[PDB]
Write a protein that binds this ligand. Structure first.
Ligand code: CNC
Ligand code: CA
Ligand code: CA
Ligand code: NA
Length: 478
């Protein structure tokens, strides 16, 4: 009397969700017999010898799972067809260096940590497991994993993000359980030493190239008056780069729009981490009451290809580490369904709001950038706590200052020269020594090759419109 396997399926077949645990608990008649063994076989190999087995697959398709049970009276076998047919919006992905870049590969020098951190969608209560080259890293259970290669080569890092989602009975023998989504990212430890990537020489102290101009929505985006300077031709990322390039050459404003908007520039040489007061400066238009702080991020061309596709490092400012500052904030903007409308956003803290359309001042059809093809996009960055406030007596708005560390901000790190009346010629100076790793520790960069300015507040001030960093120039001061 060998064993027989009972495993009830839905009458319509077993149609399951991707990235979701299904536990199979078959009834084994004559499990009492001496010499009882059970095996679970998938694509030839034995995946389990327990009485239950849990399935979870990422790819849609039909998977065959074979059960084999034995005792001293004979053997038996059963085949269950598991059809992965439904998706759910749970996503784990590693970030690229900018909106328009698609590679997730990461680059570092030997003995320099890389702080790996996935972006998540739909997760509310995530748990983390990390692996390097197939080996689970015991004790690494946090949203970031600090990985430090000690030798050149390529390393495959895997992160499984799980969430305790509600259990469901699928049949007498099948239970739907937790969600678990896996993503992988390649870390390249380059063969070079950091010092050997210093680009000496150089012909200009100014920025030499704009690589990308991806603002957030704002009243100066697609603004075609003489005040805005756009032409209507900025309908592609290449045209946006050409426009920003000419504006910066002429030291005319480039607005980043609302939170997260950014521009990426480089130089024809590396800017050293120097003993001067400042290593570089950025021209804003701040005056007292008109602070629209931009977060400064810097990048070394670790992989040597001339492109800003390596690691960004934040320059800490006066608000770094305060519990009210939000690292790794995300804002998603939506192109409105018609012309002359407010631009809606939702943020990663669960808030929602909009950038106001101001028909009195900026009369273009859209404040969402014309050259962002997609009808929604998500920008990340450090978000400072907003301090724009309206005086009720006068009704006037005060976009209040931060102490130091930010672009277009009337703080303590300004370089003499700008008008305190209208902000023309205003500059802030910056120190590469303020560069930090993602956990707040010192990055100790010897030099930088690229700068990204990221609008650092999500706010608006009535008839002033959104709080939006403007930049006008970039200069190596060493
Ligand atoms: C257009 C403009 C400007 N304005 Co008004 C005028 N006229 N502003 C306005 C309009 C902005 C509309 C919009 N775009 O959403 C408008 C009508 C709302 C306005 C209002 C005011 N402005 C006023 C003043 C005096 C000035 N503003 C000027 C900035 C003066 C500018 C003079 C100039 N630069 O030529 C100006 C001509 C050009 C600004 C600009 O487009 N910059 C380009 C943009 C890309 O940069 P930005 O950093 O984002 O500019 C922002 C700030 O300028 C802010 N803002 C504008 N005005 C002020 C004034 C103050 C005190 C503060 C703190 C912020 C502002 O709004 C702009 C858009 O967000 C000013 C330098 C002109 C001057 N007299 O020399 C002067 C401020 C001097 C100072 N205190 O340091 C008012 C007090 C006038 C009034 N009502 O009595 C009032 C105060 C606003 C407030 N704080 O609540
Ligand atoms: Ca590069
Ligand atoms: Ca602005
Ligand atoms: Na400004």
């Amino acid at each position: 009397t060998p064993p027989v396997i009972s495993l009830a399926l839905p009458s319509q077949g077993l149609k399951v969700v991707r990235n979701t645990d299904y536990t199979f608990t078959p009834d084994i008649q004559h499990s009492d017999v001496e010499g009882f063994k059970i095996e679970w076989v998938r694509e030839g190999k034995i995946v389990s010898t327990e009485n239950t087995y849990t399935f979870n697959e990422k790819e849609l398709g039909v998977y065959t799972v074979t059960i084999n049970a034995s005792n001293i009276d004979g053997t038996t076998t059963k085949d269950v067809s598991v059809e992965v047919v439904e998706t759910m919006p749970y996503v784990v992905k590693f970030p690229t260096p900018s909106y328009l870049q698609t590679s997730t590969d990461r680059y570092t020098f030997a003995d320099r940590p890389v702080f790996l951190r996935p972006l998540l969608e739909y997760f509310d209560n995530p748990r983390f497991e990390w692996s390097v080259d197939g080996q689970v890293m015991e004790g690494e259970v946090e949203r970031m994993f600090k990985f430090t290669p000690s030798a050149p080569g390529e390393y495959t890092v895997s992160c499984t993000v799980s969430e305790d989602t509600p259990t469901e009975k699928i049949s007498r023998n099948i239970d739907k359980g937790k969600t678990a989504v896996t993503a992988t990212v390649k870390v390249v430890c380059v063969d070079k030493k950091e010092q050997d990537g210093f680009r000496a020489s150089g012909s200009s102290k100014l920025w030499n190239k704009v690589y990308e101009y991806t603002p957030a929505p704002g009243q100066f985006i697609n603004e075609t008056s003489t005040i805005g300077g756009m032409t209507g031709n900025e309908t592609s990322p290449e045209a946006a780069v050409a426009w920003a390039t000419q504006r910066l050459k002429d030291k005319l404003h480039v607005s980043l729009g609302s939170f997260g908007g950014y521009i990426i520039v480089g130089f024809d040489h590396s800017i050293p981490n120097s003993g001067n007061q400042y290593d570089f400066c950025v021209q804003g238009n701040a005056f007292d009451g008109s602070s629209e702080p931009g977060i400064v991020w810097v990048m070394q061309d670790i992989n040597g290809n001339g492109l800003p596709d390596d690691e960004w490092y934040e320059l800490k400012g006066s608000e770094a580490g305060k519990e009210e500052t939000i690292q790794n904030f995300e804002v998603t903007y939506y192109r409105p369904e018609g012309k002359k409308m407010d631009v809606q956003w939702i943020s990663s803290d669960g808030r929602n709001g909009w950038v106001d359309y101001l028909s009195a001042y900026h009369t273009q059809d859209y404040y969402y950038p014309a050259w962002i093809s997609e009808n929604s996009y998500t920008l990340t960055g450090t978000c400072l706590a907003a301090r724009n406030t309206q005086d009720s007596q006068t009704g006037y708005w005060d976009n209040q200052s931060y102490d130091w560390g930010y672009v277009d901000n009337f703080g303590n790190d300004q370089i003499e020269g700008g008008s305190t009346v209208d902000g023309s010629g205003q500059r802030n100076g910056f120190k590469i020594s303020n560069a930090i790793h993602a956990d707040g520790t010192e990055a100790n960069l010897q030099y930088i090759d690229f700068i990204k300015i990221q609008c650092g507040v999500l706010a608006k001030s009535g008839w002033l419109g959104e709080v939006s960093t403007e930049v006008f120039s970039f200069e190596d001061l060493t």
